[PDB]
Write a protein that binds this ligand. Structure first.
Ligand SMILES: Nc1nc2c(ncn2[C@@H]2O[C@H](COP(=O)(O)OP(=O)(O)O)[C@@H](O)[C@H]2O)c(=O)[nH]1
Lengths: 108, 427, 96, 208, 184
């Protein structure tokens, strides 16, 4: 309950660790119902704002998650392929020097 | 409230001013970047006296730095508090003086005068009410002495009401540093007498004496000497910034101590002073401060008052203490040593109390007195100058700058009149 | 409900892993215990140094003796400057 | 709701540019052909003439000094400024023949949009017009090639409000400098000055 | 404010010399600049207000939009430097019928219509500093025919340099004034 009064006060909804949000929301809904049962409209409104911000944050968190995962996977592929390209370039260079060393011997 | 604009000519004056702003910044709690991070609300009561505010939580001091070579300016910027100083306030020339008083006064003074006046006008008009300016300069040199005399005359012309407070360092008679030192002080004193409202004298010889009498440091540097001067600097202007039980300003100090217009050259001293290890043994009380202030060893001007007589005396205190004890101490020192005080002026001692003491010091005090012992100082420089003047060779440098040779006799005659004036007021 | 919490927590944890915040307001404020520990260490060091300074000799002059007095003087000055720096109740630092 | 996703607006870069090492005045001074010398009297750096101004050929020598204004390095900059100012103020009526030849280097100098070249050219604009009491009326056909740069910096000014300005000595404010030359041109140009200036820079208001 | 204060002699409302001259006024800037600088003609610091749109750059007093002045002095004296550009300013006064009126003058104005809400006046100045004196009580008595009540609000627009805005109990000619309260 000490935390649930802070998002009623204006908490960022990000200072709360993710494990605490599922246990916060039932209290916020119940306290809003009490505050709207008593004739007090602004006290219910701040609770309504707090819960909606919590829901909006978590919804886009789901929408944003997979995008980051896809980017990371492609990035590691790009680094892996670049390393292989550098190795192939060195292999090509060594082969060309090897052929030239034989051609010079043949020419002389 | 009531602002003071601070002026730093001189390679000496720049270092003194830099240390003075370090002391004030520590006293008020100002970050080297200028942002307030202090702990006392009283520090913002009258911070406007020395500082102008730059929107964004930045305070800029009312400091103006004057020089003839950029080397001093480069050194000041390299200091810890170099960012605090406003870059545009730095006004300097490119052709130095080289301890040549005439060269600084005429050749570069005319050029530097016109420009620097615009900043001094700007900051003087950037306050709701101006009390007086403040000048820190050396007398044995050629940049601070000559240029300061020119600017002092200009300041008097532009601002007659405002108090031109000047702090100067007299050339060391035993060992100071240049061949030509008597000439510079000779020509500077004449300008100082007529224009400056208050002049304070400090000698490096006494500072080294104070170091080995009291502080017991092995290899003192210029930082310690500049710190003591800045300590006297803060004590003089402390009553303006903080409340107290008996308040006095520069105007009150001038009214009480100055009986006649030309008798205004003052000596300065500070208490308490104790070596680094002996401070535990000492019990700091009001009588102990009285003993230290009136003691000859703590006096920072090389002129023993016992050889002369006292005209007026003034004492100021920082911290919380009983006013009855201060009054009793002042009365006792006056009755005990009646052989030193002028008969026709009773109650020669002034008193004042300031509530807030400096950091680390539970109780502190500052003494400013006026005495006839100053006649020894002008006698010494006159004696050295006399055989300088009878051998014209060295003045030929100053002759090139257009200075008439008759200028030297006018200054010397003025000193002779001042010495005579101090003589007959003793009787 | 546990399954829903697991899904919610995982994606929340993945999102928070990518976005950091600047340390201008996050600069660490030292705890009272650490401040006391540093203060007492400096206090003991200063007391020892001044005790050494008191234990010297009169009239003795040489390169080693005057260098000892110089070093002990500057050591004490540095320690008291540090002590005054840590004298404040709130100290904000960025540890290296 | 969102309806577009477009570009970013250009971030006002008009003051930063600063090229170097352009002028032709260098090559004539790089071989000691320019009859100017530096005097190191300690008061102010002063220049000396290897050729007296009475016998100087204005048509060939004056345009060279106007070329040197585009220089960025010290000696060419100082020699160009002092030589140009001295020649313009003391030359007198002989300058009027050199206007069509010195406008082009002045046009090149103004077109650089440099931080420091434009103030010098603006001051040169002032001094060129006040040569004797004429030749400010001969710049009227040259407004269409000289003034187009002044539009670029016309409205730039330091907005402070309650703060007292500190830079009045080393006055660098482009707005005040532009205003001074525009008043000088408007006063000296004549009856047709305001028509051409207003056509070129519509923001300006009369001095008649 | 100024309801309580003793008002006799001179009461200055703006002065360019000091720490924060505009600390008493509100500032609105569009398409222009407001700057405080040193003017060479008087060798003293003055305030500068210049904009491309004179209507959208002005200073108003008092700061707070709801509050009103209580300046009992009938005379308002303006000291400003004319910059050969468009100029305008307005003064708000109260009338004996418990009514509010505003007198906006302009140099680019043409007529002098006196419609009930606002009053328009054309004026012409000379190049350089001016000493415009406006007698509020006389103007209300003569033009609107009503009686004058204490000044309410003051606004000054751009394209001018203003260093003195003060009130006097009566009209003073030259030298019956503090030496600071006149032009060099
Ligand atoms: N007390 C003190 N005096 C200094 C210091 N640095 C320079 N001076 C003084 O500066 C004087 C020389 O001044 P000069 O070189 O001509 O420059 P000026 O001060 O502007 O005239 C000497 O008499 C020195 O005593 C310092 O750190 N402390």
């Amino acid at each position: 309950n000490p935390t649930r009064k802070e998002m009623a006060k204006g908490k960022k909804t990000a200072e709360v660790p993710p494990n605490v949000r599922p246990k916060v929301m039932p209290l916020l809904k119940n306290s809003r119902s009490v505050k709207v049962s008593r004739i007090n409209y602004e006290s219910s409104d701040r609770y309504d704002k707090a819960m909606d911000q919590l829901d909006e944050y978590q919804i886009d968190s789901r929408r944003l998650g997979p995008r980051f995962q896809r980017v990371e996977a492609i990035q590691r592929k790009l680094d892996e392929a670049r390393m292989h390209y550098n190795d192939v370039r060195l292999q090509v260079h060594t082969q060309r020097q090897q052929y030239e060393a034989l051609e010079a011997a043949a020419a002389e | 409230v009531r602002e003071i604009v601070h002026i730093q000519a001189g390679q000496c004056g720049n270092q003194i001013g830099a240390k003075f702003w370090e002391v004030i910044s520590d006293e008020h709690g100002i970050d080297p970047t200028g942002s307030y991070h202090g702990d006392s609300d009283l520090q913002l009561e009258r911070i406007n006296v020395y500082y102008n505010e730059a929107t964004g939580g930045k305070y800029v001091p009312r400091a103006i730095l004057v020089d003839l070579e950029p080397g001093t300016m480069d050194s000041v910027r390299a200091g810890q508090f170099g960012q605090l100083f406003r870059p545009d306030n730095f006004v300097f020339g490119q052709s130095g003086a080289g301890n040549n008083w005439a060269k600084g006064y005429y050749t570069e003074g005319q050029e530097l005068c016109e420009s620097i006046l615009d900043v001094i006008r700007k900051e003087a008009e950037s306050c709701d009410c101006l009390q007086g300016f403040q000048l820190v300069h050396s007398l044995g040199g050629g940049t601070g002495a000559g240029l300061g005399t020119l600017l002092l005359n200009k300041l008097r012309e532009e601002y007659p009401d405002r108090i031109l407070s000047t702090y100067s360092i007299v050339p060391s008679p035993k060992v100071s540093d240049t061949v030509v030192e008597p000439y510079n002080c000779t020509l500077s004193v004449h300008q100082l007498v007529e224009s400056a409202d208050e002049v304070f004298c400090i000698d490096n010889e006494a500072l080294y004496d104070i170091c080995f009498r009291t502080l017991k440091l092995t290899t003192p540097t210029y930082g310690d000497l500049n710190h003591l001067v800045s300590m006297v600097m803060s004590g003089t202007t402390c009553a303006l910034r903080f409340p107290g039980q008996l308040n006095s300003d520069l105007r009150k100090l001038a009214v009480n101590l100055v009986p006649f217009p030309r008798l205004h050259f003052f000596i300065v001293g500070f208490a308490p002073l104790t070596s680094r290890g002996s401070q535990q043994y000492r019990a700091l009380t009001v009588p102990e401060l009285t003993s230290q202030l009136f003691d000859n060893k703590n006096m920072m001007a090389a002129c023993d008052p016992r050889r002369g007589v006292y005209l007026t005396a003034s004492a100021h205190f920082r911290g919380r203490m009983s006013s009855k004890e201060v009054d009793e101490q002042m009365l006792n020192i006056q009755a005990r040593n009646t052989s030193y005080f002028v008969e026709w002026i009773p109650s020669n001692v002034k008193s004042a109390i300031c509530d807030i003491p400096p950091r680390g010091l539970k109780m502190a005090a500052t003494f400013i007195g006026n005495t006839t012992a100053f006649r020894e100082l002008f006698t010494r420089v006159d004696s050295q100058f006399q055989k300088m003047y009878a051998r014209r060779a060295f003045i030929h440098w100053y002759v090139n700058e257009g200075l008439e040779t008759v200028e030297f006799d006018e200054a010397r005659s003025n000193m002779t009149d001042l010495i005579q004036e101090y003589e007959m007021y003793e009787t | 409900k546990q399954e829903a919490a697991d899904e919610a927590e995982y994606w929340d944890n993945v999102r928070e892993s990518m976005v950091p915040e600047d340390t201008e307001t996050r600069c660490r404020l030292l705890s009272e215990e650490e401040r006391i520990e540093i203060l007492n260490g400096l206090y003991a060091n200063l007391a020892e140094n001044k005790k050494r300074y008191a234990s010297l000799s009169f009239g003795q002059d040489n390169l080693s003796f005057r260098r000892k007095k110089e070093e002990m003087e500057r050591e004490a000055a540095q320690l008291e400057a540090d002590i005054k720096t840590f004298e404040r109740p709130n100290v904000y630092i960025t540890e290296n | 709701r969102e309806v577009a996703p477009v570009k970013r607006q250009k971030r006002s870069l008009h003051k930063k540019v600063s090229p170097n090492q352009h002028t032709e005045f260098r090559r004539f001074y790089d071989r000691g052909d320019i009859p100017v010398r530096l005097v190191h009297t300690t008061f102010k750096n002063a220049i000396a003439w290897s050729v007296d101004p009475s016998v100087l050929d204005y048509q060939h020598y004056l345009p060279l000094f106007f070329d040197g204004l585009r220089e960025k390095e010290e000696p060419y900059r100082f020699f160009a400024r002092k030589g140009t100012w001295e020649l313009l103020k003391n030359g007198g009526t002989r300058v009027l023949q050199c206007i069509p030849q010195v406008v082009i280097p002045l046009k090149k100098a103004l077109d650089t949009r440099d931080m420091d070249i434009v103030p010098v050219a603006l001051r040169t604009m002032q001094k060129l017009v006040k040569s004797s009491e004429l030749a400010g009326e001969a710049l009227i056909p040259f407004y269409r090639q000289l003034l187009p740069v002044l539009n670029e910096f016309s409205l730039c000014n330091k907005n402070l409000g309650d703060r007292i300005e500190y830079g009045q000595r080393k006055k660098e404010n482009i707005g005040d400098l532009i205003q001074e030359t525009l008043e000088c041109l408007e006063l000296n140009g004549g009856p047709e000055a305001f028509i051409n200036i207003q056509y070129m820079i519509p923001t300006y208001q009369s001095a008649k | 404010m100024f309801r309580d204060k003793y008002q006799a002699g001179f009461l200055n409302l703006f002065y360019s010399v000091g720490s924060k001259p505009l600390s008493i006024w509100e500032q609105h800037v569009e398409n222009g600049y407001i700057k405080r600088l040193t003017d060479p003609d008087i060798r003293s610091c003055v305030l500068e207000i210049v904009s491309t749109t004179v209507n959208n750059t002005y200073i108003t007093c008092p700061i707070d939009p709801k509050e009103e002045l209580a300046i009992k002095l009938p005379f308002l004296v303006l000291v400003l430097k004319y910059l050969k550009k468009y100029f305008t300013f307005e003064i708000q006064v109260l009338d004996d019928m418990n009514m509010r009126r505003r007198f906006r003058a302009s140099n680019f104005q043409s007529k002098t219509r006196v419609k009930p809400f606002v009053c328009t006046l054309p004026m012409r100045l000379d190049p350089g500093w001016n000493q415009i004196q406006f007698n509020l009580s006389d103007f209300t008595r003569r033009a609107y025919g009503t009686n004058y009540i204490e000044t309410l609000r003051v606004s000054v627009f751009a394209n001018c340099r203003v260093r003195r805005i003060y009130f006097s109990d009566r009209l003073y000619t030259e030298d019956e004034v503090p030496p600071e309260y006149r032009l060099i």
